[PDB]
Design a protein around this ligand. Structure first.
Ligand SMILES: Nc1ncnc2c1ncn2[C@@H]1O[C@H](COP(=O)(O)OP(=O)(O)OP(=O)(O)O)[C@@H](O)[C@H]1O
Ligand SMILES: Nc1ncnc2c1ncn2[C@@H]1O[C@H](COP(=O)(O)OP(=O)(O)OP(=O)(O)O)[C@@H](O)[C@H]1O
Lengths: 159, 597, 208, 594, 181
């Protein structure tokens, strides 16, 4: 698949900095970029630039506010949370985070989250200015199939 | 007695029309997402329910909740403890005796009202499940208080072997329901002789509260029971309604069904909307094509930017209509009132322009100064409409200068100083200095001294009086068809059902299309309007050197960009284009020339 | 910054899916964004002549410097990052006209794929030769079956053998095979099952 | 008790590890308070329990605190206070809690009340505008039989224990215990506590437009009284609680609620959307950019990111907002050390634009909208009887203006009765009033920002530049800067405007608010003979050129001419009044006058 | 190329696999059937059973020359004993006819006016049993482990209704479990 769901999800930004000083700039004069300078990085190049060197080039700093000031909020009540305005996806960004990181700490704690969100979703499936709908919209695709199954299954079962 | 209970638990688990098994098929659907509520439907409920109501009419105030104990006992059958009690919602429709027959044969019978709700109180609490302690003997019991005869259905007795009235209300194991005391007002059209309208009071339960905003048409069905307050002659009491269910019309908070939007998308792909509305908006208006297009863009509006800094832009447009008497600027304004979601109509004499926005007064309880009234705070999201902008000089201009252009007032009267929000949209229709002389002299003499209001509004029409001998005779042919014969009421009903749009369809899709899409104009248009303005200012600049003064300043240039954003809300496209924007200036280029001649 | 227009390119690609796949089968595919893809065809042109300068200096200037190797990677990576989107929008374009090509693959005057979206019927006229190369290929798949099996429609299973069907919006005399049914205007039938399958998908009969 | 006490004791062994990191903290805070009190020749009992130490490893004990918060908190106190004595008993007041953390979806905006969580933990935010009185209250008085020398003991329970609805004691003070001894009471060993109610409005931006703001109220205790100035973005957390008898205490009880909403809470916090602690890093960088000799100009251009030009206006706002000092005269009247600028301009020329975004970075300076009811600087003797026998001079609008800024509009579109009030508060820092009560001189450090419009359209050039608004010169003489905004039409000027509005329908702010609020805490030079020698020469030539030209200036204008340069050195963050500051002060007035 | 309903069955063919099962009739009539799975008989005798496939018998009922016998568990005195073995056993469902829900809906179109008093009793005694199954299914999925389930007695219909969501939740959590190591 050409992956139209997440090719934009790697289009999002990500703040990290350098370890070396490189004259390769495309961001606009002053072609030497000084080291340890915090730069907004798109996920695609930044994923492999933290790999290619021994010592890689980009200082991968963790955006630990996407670690510590939300691990607490999801370790309390997984019912109505801001899962969305902090990150327009919470799923593949968590996937491609853990591939470089490989730490089972938060890899346990979102595994608690999903079944709890799923526990709402099935038994929410039988049949307002800016922020609110997309709480109800990141869940949409995941169940847009599901209640459309229940919709026809009544319409055969009755007359 | 009891056993009625057995006549209904053995009745709602099987009532159906032909093989759909509906009430279990919705209660199951209603215990899941938490609402805990019912409705009733048609006739046999009526057919034998009168045979129950011939033993419920005697007191439909205590054995109405004898329904309520039943459905909990069918609820636990669909569970297998955290189980609340339920509520009821009714339906009935034959007519509406407005406010006439209200003491003789209507104590504790089912009534139906049509009114306009005006005033909401703050919430409160009464209990429904308590726990009770005897003082020195320490008895423990629990009493439930379900339906009412306001307070004091039953009291607390003296028997625990401890002393008299030893009973106290703990707050550890208690539930609560909320009441309203919202006030109802008579719809001002049904009983005209010479009278002034009256008013009643009512309460409700929590799973039907906060469902109304002030300024709406509404209908309601409920009881007409009587309380007795001891804060006037013999022992007289007062009337009030105990409501049951508001099967209202629309809200006029964006949840609705899906087949509504299906036709809307099926209509919005046909690209004839801009021309077909101008015939179908006002079925009683001869032409007036430049003015008519200004109204549809006024009703929907643009957007609002809270862009990542401190300040903000104002996403709205505000028009004026000044001209000779007999050019239908008046009766056009009643026409926007019914079609708007929220509309008020205060169009006359300003009505004490300091008391237009805010009022404070002493209080019957605690002698306090709190905020009560306003014409603007009622009218947010929608459109107001006023007139007579010649003979108000007192406070009408000093009250709208702050109310417009930033839409952020704060009252600094004796109590609070709070910046309450406002997102209003104004409209006015004045007279010039008897019309003809302002079109037969130097083009001044419109407002008595100041033009500073005129820079605050962008769109200005200046109509006039021609003498074209073929357009009047059609008009004289027009209005006799609409006065008597009512043949165009049969004609426009004949072009309705495939080509035109009635009034009740226009209202519902405007609130849908505004509250879904969010436009933005394309950067290819940025070269277009910039090249437009520099000669527009120059056309003004060539006029000032000829000793011709007055008014154009830069609010209009940031008003055209809202105008071109307006039809983008109409087409519901997330961009804006060039055939989009060239028709937009074609409305405003026409209104630049009349600003000079 | 770099692949920014491709982000909003694939963003409006998301709208084309949700328009079709939620409402109904009737596609009315919007437009091809030649104006949008000409912008990224301009940036890929400027980016390509950027690296051949450093391909020219890597033997003469910095002398295959480690900095220059990373400077090749950003120019390498931003190419293919752009390359990922521009075909993905290209595939989701062509993976929905096939559904138009399948359901009306020839049932009644096939090569009349006219009276159909004239503002985009010149757009997909460059894709018509792609489209008809489905249509030519779908013909020999109909004939290359060693027995006669229908491949044009009839996807819902049959239930009964007698179905009341009404007609409207149609005239003339059709159905020369399987016995002529003599279609007059606004007159219902009461027939067997297998005949009307080639006419309901044709869209002449209306209600089951 | 065994069932209701067992999970107390099992918690009594559980939470002792949940203060492994606080059992140091709770004794370190008192050992010096025990020390300094013995060598004078002070803090309450705050034990902040986080969520984290009670959610990582207890679940049954957890959700009891967020479902039934009535059988758990006096367990947590009683097991706390023994650790106070088991740690500290050798040297010769209950230590209640605060409970900070997150909550997981209990940010009930009080426009909404709850059906789910009544009698539970609630997090509430908003603004307070009531600020009622303070009044002590007894909890325990000790009696003493003066004959036979023996003592007694008595505690009074009330609606203040926050949780247990005990049998009340409808009594004030008893006499004659079961003896023939006249009872004596020791008041030094009788303990007291205070009691203060405050009403909280709604944050009037996130409540959607269908209603006026609503309100509820909260009873707090001594530990955070006088912390709540009226006009603070406060955020409280406490228990939800009903009290009062509804339906039985009077008979027939028809349509009378008897269930008052109360919050018996703890631990308020001011928020900001005064306490901004910065590290060594940012405090050093702000000195590092202080080393540049251009940063007065960069701050001018980095303020209003929408509007072209007006750099004379733009430097003035940041000069005014940061503020110039007033050195009070010892046994003498202090002078004006406030600064008070004014604007006027022909309409739609961004005169009200920059007036509303000074309120976002205001640093606790909440202004009005200039609606000129009597109350702009006064009280109007509003007491509301304050529970039958208390009369209070309720603060109208100057308790918010103190060491802050205000802004009001529409001067000529006002009556007379506000203009007499703005006379007093400008010539004098204080108002003093005796309406039906007490003469009281309460102090105020204010600084107005003005906005008016000319009367007769575009008539400024063809007539006198003066009298152009003709409001009384009592204020014009008390003001200094009358910027007259031009709107001249040039084809390169407007073309530049046209794209810049268009480019924005789609050096930082929080660093800027730190820099000024750090610069209110640095020392004030005032002292260099060199800079005072040049400015008086700079005065004298225009003292020859004020009277034969446009506008006569006075001696108080010299007190500006120190004050602008005095604040201009506050931008420099130095203690030497340089020379370079005196050149921008002269040049700013030269555009203001010519 | 359906591209519409691919990952599961539509509800119109789940009846198609069950209609090809045989039941018993009471024939009436007297070459006849050469339908490649036929067992045509001679002049057929009434008052006797015969295992006949379903879909031809529904067609044989429209011309109305035969009659149907209900299967042996379709009395109200039989279904009651099913509701007791489950109400004492909240662990799972006990005893299942395996195609019961789709079997009744075919049986209520001129296959209901033949049997001895089933109206106002049978739809009573079925629609209760549908939800009691699905109340049981709501407690089960909350207990979801990794990659191992226990569904013992489910109708084919709920299998067509639990299907299109139960995959991609456990599949998406299969990633974060496996890509963690
Ligand atoms: N262009 C028009 N098309 C249809 N009807 C019109 C038009 N202009 C006026 N009328 C009719 O005039 C009738 C009475 O309107 P009226 O005479 O009150 O206007 P008016 O209020 O005097 O105008 P003005 O507001 O300028 O004073 C209405 O029934 C309306 O139908
Ligand atoms: N001189 C200016 N330069 C740039 N933009 C301006 C200027 N004047 C007005 N604008 C634009 O016009 C909009 C509103 O201006 P504003 O309403 O503040 O005028 P005003 O200061 O209120 O005048 P008045 O008080 O007389 O109504 C702003 O969004 C701003 O971008």
């Amino acid at each position: 698949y050409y992956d139209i769901d997440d090719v934009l999800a790697d289009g999002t930004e990500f703040p990290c900095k350098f370890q070396y000083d490189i004259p390769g700039l495309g961001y606009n004069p002053g072609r030497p970029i000084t080291k340890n300078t915090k730069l907004s990085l798109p996920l695609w190049l930044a994923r492999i630039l933290a790999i290619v060197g021994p010592v890689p080039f980009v200082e991968l700093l963790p955006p630990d506010m996407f670690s510590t000031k939300v691990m607490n909020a999801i370790k309390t009540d997984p019912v109505a949370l801001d899962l969305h305005s902090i990150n327009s996806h919470f799923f593949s960004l968590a996937i491609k985070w853990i591939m470089l990181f490989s730490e089972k700490e938060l890899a346990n704690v979102v595994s608690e989250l999903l079944l709890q969100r799923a526990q709402e979703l099935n038994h929410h499936a039988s049949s307002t200015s800016t922020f609110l709908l997309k709480l109800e919209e990141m869940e949409k695709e995941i169940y847009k199939k599901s209640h459309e199954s229940y919709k026809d299954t009544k319409r055969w079962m009755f007359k | 007695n009891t056993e009625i209970i057995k006549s209904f638990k053995n009745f709602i688990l099987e009532f159906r029309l032909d093989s759909q098994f509906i009430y279990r098929d919705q209660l199951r659907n209603n215990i899941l997402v938490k609402n805990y509520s019912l409705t009733v439907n048609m006739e046999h409920l009526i057919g034998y329910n009168e045979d129950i109501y011939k033993k419920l009419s005697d007191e439909p105030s205590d054995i109405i909740p004898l329904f309520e104990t039943a459905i909990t006992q069918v609820a636990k059958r669909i569970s297998i403890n955290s189980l609340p009690t339920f509520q009821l919602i009714l339906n009935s429709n034959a007519n509406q005796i407005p406010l006439r027959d209200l003491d003789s044969e209507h104590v504790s019978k089912i009534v139906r009202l049509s009114g306009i709700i005006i005033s909401t109180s703050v919430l409160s609490s009464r209990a429904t499940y308590l726990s009770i302690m005897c003082r020195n003997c320490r008895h423990t019991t629990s009493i439930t208080i379900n339906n009412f005869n306001t307070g004091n259905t039953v009291s607390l007795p003296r028997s625990c072997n401890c002393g008299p009235d030893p009973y106290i209300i703990i707050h550890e194991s208690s539930k609560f329901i909320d009441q309203q005391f919202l006030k109802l007002q008579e719809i001002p059209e049904l009983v005209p002789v010479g009278e002034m309208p009256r008013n009643l009071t009512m309460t409700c339960d929590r799973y039907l509260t906060n469902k109304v905003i002030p300024g709406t048409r509404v209908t309601i069905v409920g009881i007409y029971s009587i309380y007795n307050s001891k804060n006037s002659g013999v022992a007289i009491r007062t009337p009030y309604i105990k409501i049951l269910g508001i099967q209202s019309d629309v809200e006029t908070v964006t949840m609705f069904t899906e087949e509504e939007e299906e036709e809307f998308l099926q209509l919005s792909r046909n690209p004839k909307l801009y021309e077909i509305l101008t015939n179908s908006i006002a079925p009683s208006i001869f032409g007036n094509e430049d003015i008519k297009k200004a109204i549809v863009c006024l009703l929907m509006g643009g957007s609002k930017k809270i862009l990542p800094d401190g300040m903000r832009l104002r996403g709205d447009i505000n028009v004026l209509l000044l001209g000779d008497p007999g050019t239908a600027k008046s009766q056009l304004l009643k026409f926007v009132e019914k079609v708007s979601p929220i509309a008020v109509y205060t169009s006359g004499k300003g009505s004490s322009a300091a008391g237009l926005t805010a009022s404070v007064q002493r209080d019957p309880m605690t002698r306090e100064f709190y905020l009560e009234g306003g014409a603007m705070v009622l009218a947010d999201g929608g459109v107001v409409c006023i007139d007579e902008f010649d003979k108000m000089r007192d406070e009408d201009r000093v009250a709208i200068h702050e109310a417009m252009e930033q839409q952020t007032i704060s009252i600094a009267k004796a109590g609070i100083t709070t910046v309450l929000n406002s997102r209003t949209s104004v409209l006015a229709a004045a007279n010039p200095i008897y019309g003809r002389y302002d079109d037969l002299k130097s083009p001044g003499d419109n407002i008595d001294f100041q033009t500073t209001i005129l820079s605050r509004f962008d769109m200005i029409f200046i109509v006039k009086d021609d003498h074209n001998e073929e357009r009047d005779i059609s008009i004289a042919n027009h209005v006799i068809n609409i006065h008597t014969g009512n043949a165009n009421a049969m004609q426009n009903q004949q072009e309705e059902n495939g080509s035109e749009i009635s009034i009740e369809k226009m209202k519902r899709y405007i609130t849908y299309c505004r509250l879904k899409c969010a436009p933005r104009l394309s950067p290819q248009a940025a070269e277009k309007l910039s090249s437009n303005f520099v000669t527009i200012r120059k056309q003004l600049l060539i006029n000032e050197l000829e000793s011709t003064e007055r008014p154009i300043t830069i609010r209009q240039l940031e008003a055209i960009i809202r105008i071109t954003e307006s039809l983008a809300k109409l087409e519901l496209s997330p961009i804006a284009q060039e055939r989009h924007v060239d028709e937009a200036i074609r409305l405003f280029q026409a209104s630049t020339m009349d600003a000079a001649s | 910054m770099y692949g920014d227009l491709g982000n909003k390119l694939v963003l409006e690609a998301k709208r084309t899916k949700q328009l079709y796949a939620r409402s109904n089968q009737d596609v009315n595919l919007p437009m091809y964004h030649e104006d949008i893809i000409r912008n990224i065809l301009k940036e890929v042109s400027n980016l390509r002549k950027n690296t051949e300068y450093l391909k020219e200096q890597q033997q003469l200037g910095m002398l295959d410097d480690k900095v220059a190797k990373c400077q090749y990677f950003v120019t390498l990576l931003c190419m293919e990052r752009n390359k990922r989107c521009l075909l993905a929008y290209q595939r989701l374009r062509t993976d929905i006209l096939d559904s138009m090509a399948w359901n009306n693959n020839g049932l009644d005057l096939m090569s009349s794929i006219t009276f159909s979206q004239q503002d985009t019927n010149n757009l997909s006229h460059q894709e018509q030769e792609y489209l008809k190369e489905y249509c030519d290929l779908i013909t020999d798949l109909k004939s290359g079956d060693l027995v006669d099996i229908d491949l044009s429609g009839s996807l819902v299973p049959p239930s009964d053998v007698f179905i009341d069907v009404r007609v409207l919006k149609d005239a003339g005399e059709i159905q020369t095979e399987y016995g002529v049914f003599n279609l007059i205007k606004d007159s219902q039938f009461f027939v067997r099952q297998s005949d009307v399958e080639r006419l309901i998908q044709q869209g002449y009969l209306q209600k089951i | 008790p065994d069932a209701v006490f067992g999970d107390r004791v099992r918690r009594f062994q559980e939470f002792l590890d949940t203060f492994t990191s606080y059992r140091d903290s709770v004794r370190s805070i008192q050992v010096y308070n025990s020390n300094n009190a013995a060598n004078y020749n002070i803090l309450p009992h705050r034990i902040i329990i986080s969520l984290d130490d009670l959610r990582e490893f207890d679940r049954s004990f957890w959700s009891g605190i967020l479902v039934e918060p009535a059988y758990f908190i006096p367990p947590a106190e009683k097991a706390l206070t023994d650790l106070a004595d088991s740690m500290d008993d050798v040297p010769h007041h209950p230590w209640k809690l605060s409970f900070k953390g997150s909550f997981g979806a209990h940010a009930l905006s009080p426009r909404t009340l709850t059906a789910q969580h009544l009698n539970k933990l609630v997090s509430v935010e908003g603004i307070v505008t009531k600020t009622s009185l303070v009044r002590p209250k007894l909890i325990r008085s000790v009696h003493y039989a003066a004959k036979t020398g023996r003592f007694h003991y008595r505690d009074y329970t009330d609606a203040t224990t926050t949780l247990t609805t005990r049998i009340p004691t409808p009594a004030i003070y008893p006499t004659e215990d079961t003896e023939g001894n006249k009872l004596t009471t020791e008041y030094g060993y009788s303990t007291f506590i205070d009691h203060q109610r405050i009403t909280v409005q709604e944050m009037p931006e996130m409540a959607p437009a269908g209603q006026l703001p609503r309100s509820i109220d909260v009873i707090l205790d001594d530990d955070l009284v006088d912390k709540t100035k009226p006009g603070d973005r406060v955020n409280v957390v406490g228990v939800f609680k009903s009290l009062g008898a509804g339906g039985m205490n009077q008979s027939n009880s028809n349509t009378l609620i008897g269930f008052k909403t109360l919050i018996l809470g703890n631990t308020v916090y001011p928020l900001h959307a005064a306490r901004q602690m910065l590290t060594d890093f940012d405090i050093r960088n702000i000195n590092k950019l202080s080393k540049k000799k251009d940063i007065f100009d960069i701050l001018s251009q980095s303020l209003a990111p929408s509007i072209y030009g007006h750099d004379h206006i733009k430097k003035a706002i940041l000069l005014m907002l940061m503020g110039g000092v007033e050195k009070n005269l010892e046994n003498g009247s202090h002078l004006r050390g406030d600064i008070n600028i004014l604007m006027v301009g022909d309409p739609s020329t961004a005169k009200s634009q920059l007036l509303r975004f000074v309120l976002n970075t205001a640093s606790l300076a909440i202004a009005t909208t200039g609606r000129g009811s009597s109350g702009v600087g006064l009280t109007a003797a509003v007491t509301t009887d304050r529970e039958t026998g208390e009369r209070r001079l309720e603060a109208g609008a100057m308790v918010l203006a103190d060491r802050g800024v205000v802004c009001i509009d529409e001067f000529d579109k006002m009556t007379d009765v506000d203009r007499v009030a703005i006379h007093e508060v400008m010539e004098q820092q204080t108002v003093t009033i005796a309406k039906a009560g007490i003469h009281t001189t309460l102090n105020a450090r204010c600084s107005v920002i003005a906005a008016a419009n000319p009367v007769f359209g575009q008539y400024d050039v063809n007539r006198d530049p003066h009298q152009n608004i003709a409001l009384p010169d009592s204020l014009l003489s008390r003001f200094d800067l009358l910027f007259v905004v031009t709107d001249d039409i040039n084809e390169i000027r407007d073309r530049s405007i046209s794209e810049h509005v268009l480019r924005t329908h789609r050096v930082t702010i929080p660093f800027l608010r730190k820099y000024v609020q750090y610069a209110k805490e640095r020392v004030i030079p005032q002292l260099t003979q060199e800079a005072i020698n040049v400015i008086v020469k700079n005065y004298t030539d225009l003292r020859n050129d004020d009277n034969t030209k446009k506008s006569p200036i006075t001696a108080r204008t010299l007190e500006t001419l120190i004050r602008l340069a005095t604040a201009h050195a506050k931008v420099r963050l130095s203690k030497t009044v340089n020379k370079v500051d005196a050149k921008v002060a002269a040049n700013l007035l030269r555009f203001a006058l010519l | 190329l359906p591209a519409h309903l691919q990952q599961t069955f539509s509800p119109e063919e789940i009846q198609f696999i069950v209609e090809n099962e045989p039941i018993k009739i009471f024939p009436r009539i007297t070459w006849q059937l050469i339908t490649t799975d036929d067992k045509a008989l001679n002049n057929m005798v009434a008052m006797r059973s015969t295992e006949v496939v379903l879909w031809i018998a529904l067609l044989l009922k429209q011309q109305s020359k035969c009659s149907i016998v209900a299967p042996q568990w379709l009395t109200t005195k039989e279904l009651d004993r099913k509701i007791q073995y489950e109400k004492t056993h909240p662990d799972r469902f006990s005893e299942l006819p395996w195609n019961w829900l789709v079997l009744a809906r075919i049986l209520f179109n001129k296959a209901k006016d033949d049997f001895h008093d089933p109206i106002h009793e049978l739809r009573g005694k079925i629609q209760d049993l549908r939800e009691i199954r699905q109340i049981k299914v709501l407690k089960g999925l909350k207990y979801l482990n990794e990659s191992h389930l226990q569904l013992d007695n489910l109708s084919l219909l709920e299998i067509n209704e639990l299907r299109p969501f139960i995959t991609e939740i456990m599949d998406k959590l299969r990633e974060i479990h496996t890509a963690s190591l």
